[PDB]
Nucleic acid binder design. Structure first.
Lengths: 113, 103
DNA sequence: CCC
């Protein structure tokens, strides 16, 4: 069972330029009706320890004490990936509603929505 | 110069629809977010997906914007421009994205 | 330049 705003570890694939890659935490941003459906995949935003040299308006600071990640991290709202559900076995934690609202504002900015 | 609603051929070979907004497209950001286009007619039946009749885009076949297939690509890998998705259909794409992402 |  995968839910929006949950954080998982995921393989993002081999490196290719600045494409998301390697094993990283990811934040599920796909909505729960799709998460509960027969759809094989989930959309997520990539989390990094910081966004040094990739600092975008809309990026969101995630305190370690709020997410259960080992360190303070950042949601990179311009780094979006689609992953297989069956590959999301490694559950880390979650982002609370108040902070997820900031993530949503960032995504709306990035996608002109 | 990459703009929202443009269709490009991309190595994932598939057509992709730029959904990243133009301030980010014009910035030094190295990447662009896109929705994957497919010519599998069955996917027209998935809620949120947007049907693109061949005559509405310059693609060779009837296609579908798959709003659940989102990729982030290097800008420099978007060289092969097809055209644009017209405003009317882009509004449907936006609605689909809002549904899929709870936005 | 899907099946």
């Amino acid at each position: 069972v995968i839910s929006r705003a949950e954080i998982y570890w995921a393989d993002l694939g081999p490196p290719s330029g600045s494409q998301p890659a390697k094993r990283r935490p990811v934040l599920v941003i796909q909505s729960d009706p799709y998460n509960a459906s027969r759809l094989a995949t989930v959309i997520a935003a990539v989390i990094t320890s910081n966004d040094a040299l990739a600092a975008m308006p809309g990026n969101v600071d995630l305190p370690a004490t709020t997410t259960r990640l080992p360190r303070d991290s950042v949601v990179n709202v311009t780094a979006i990936v689609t992953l297989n559900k069956t590959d999301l076995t490694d559950r880390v934690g979650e982002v609370p509603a108040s902070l997820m609202h900031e993530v949503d504002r960032g995504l709306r900015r990035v996608l002109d929505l």
